[PDB]
Amino acid sequence: MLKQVEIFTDGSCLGNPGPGGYGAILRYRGREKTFSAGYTRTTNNRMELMAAIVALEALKEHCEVILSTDSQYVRQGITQWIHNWKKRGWKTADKKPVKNVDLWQRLDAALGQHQIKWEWVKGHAGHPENERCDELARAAAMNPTLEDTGYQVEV
Ligand SMILES: [Mg+2]
Ligand SMILES: [Mg+2]
């Protein structure tokens, strides 16, 4: 029996690129734990990944994780893209580098540590933990303290 935990994630960004942040909630037994940090120039999609990465890397043993997010980008990557990446060596079909490969690879490493059941959510409405993660992410985007060193500036 693996430890059973719940993770909720969201990203937020004031531009594209602009200041942004991530928010994550990790719930196990009774102890609830929040994660957030703000970055001076990033994208929403990079913050969506960081939220999952940071919450997963926090786990210090093999767990059964229920991971809830409304990110259509993470969903597309998890369910549509990463299988192609793993047989093409993390390049596109045209042999080009994959966008955000630094975070996708880091997320995939953390994903391999646990038994993940993904819960895709249509929207914040009717999901209080996912809306709290948006609040956490937005709060960090309004008070950025770090640089997103992996963001390759597209502008
Ligand atoms: Mg989001
Ligand atoms: Mg958001």
Author numbering: 1 to 155
Paper text:
The ribonuclease (RNase) H family of enzymes catalyze the specific cleavage of RNA strands of RNA/DNA hybrid duplexes and play an important role in DNA replication and repair. RNase H cleaves the phosphodiester bonds of RNA in double-stranded DNA/RNA hybrids, leaving 3′-hydroxyl and 5′-phosphate groups at each cleaved site. This catalysis requires divalent cations such as Mg2+, Mn2+ and Zn2+. Structural analyses found that the DEDD motif coordinates the divalent cation at the active site, acting as metal ligands, and constitutes the pivotal scaffold for the catalytic reaction.
In the RNH_Mg_2 structure an Mg2+ ion is bound in a different position to those in the other two structures, RNH_Mg_1 and RNH_Mg_3, which are very similar to each other. The exact reason for the observed variation in the binding of the Mg2+ ion is unknown.
